[PDB]
Every structure is written in C-alpha cells, then in structure tokens.
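in:
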C-alpha cells in the first residue's frame, strides 16, 4: 500500500544505478505525498534532472533543490513551505529519508538520505521513508562526497518516478 519511488542516479552524466524508496504514507501521508509527486513530476515540477549538492561521507546525502541546485531553493507541492507533520519515526540508521528544513515548519523539497545513525535529528526533522533497494548505490554516491560536503563529480537524478 505504501508507494515505492525510484531514482536513477548518474555521475557526470554516466549511469551509476537505481535506488528505490518506500514512502511511509501510512504515518506521514502529507510528507510522503509531496516526495511522491515531486518524483513523478505530475504537478509540473520536481526532482528529475536535479543534483545532490551536498554529500558528507559517514553522515548523509542531500538533494532536492531543483530550483537553485545548491541548498537555497526548492518548493513543495503545497507552496513554498509546509508544516512538520509529526515525529513518529526516528533516525535509526543508514538508509532513512528525512526532510531538510530551516527551522520549525519550513519543509520544502530538500531531503537527506542518511548513511549513518543520526539520532540528534529526532524530533526536529520529519522521517518519511527508507531505502528499499539499492543501498549499495547510495554507498557508491557517498564516495563522491567530502568533509565539507562538496562533490568531486556532479551527481544527478537522471530519471525518477513511481514503481508501485
């Protein structure tokens, strides 16, 4: 019942592999729907062609800024920002999807994929999905990051959509 979405990742335009996510629509339906719709592009905008602008090995991959490509942009399907829906789910380990934000109730389109347990984010960032297939591809992406987050190659979402 929970939706599955996929990202096809490229590295300087060269295919790397696919990552699929389960979105926890049962518990955070508003947050899950935003990511789902941005992945299909069905509202006329979304993640296809956008880059991961910040990757910190041993911490997370960050993406979703499809308007400014650097962490200063993005928007949700509900407007420029929407509310923290709940904090039911926790940052338990690698492979968690969690919203990036700039304070309370400032969710847009940016997100983190964790590559470590990040428990200090509990109750501040809204967890809304997990990596289902392709965690090995997230691990491969992580190798193009650096301590300050700058990527050594351009990591893009070459295609994305819904699998079920």
């Amino acid at each position: 019942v929970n939706p599955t979405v996929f990202f096809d990742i490229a590295v300087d335009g060269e295919p790397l592999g696919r990552v699929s996510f389960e979105l926890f629509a049962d518990k955070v339906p508003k947050t899950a729907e935003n990511f789902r719709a941005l992945s299909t592009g069905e509202k006329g905008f979304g993640y296809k062609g956008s880059c991961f602008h910040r990757i910190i090995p041993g911490f997370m991959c960050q993406g979703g800024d499809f308007t400014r490509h650097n962490g200063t942009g993005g928007k949700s399907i509900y407007g420029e920002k929407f509310e923290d829906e709940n904090f039911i789910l926790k940052h338990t380990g690698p492979g968690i999807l969690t919203m990036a934000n700039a304070g309370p109730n400032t969710n847009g389109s940016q997100f983190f994929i964790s590559t470590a347990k990040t428990e200090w984010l509990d109750g501040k960032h809204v967890v809304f999905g997990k990596v289902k297939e392709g965690m090995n591809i997230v691990e491969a992406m992580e190798r193009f990051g650096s301590r300050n987050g700058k990527t050594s190659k351009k990591i893009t979402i070459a295609d994305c959509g819904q699998l079920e």
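note: The first strand starts at residue 4 and ends at 11.
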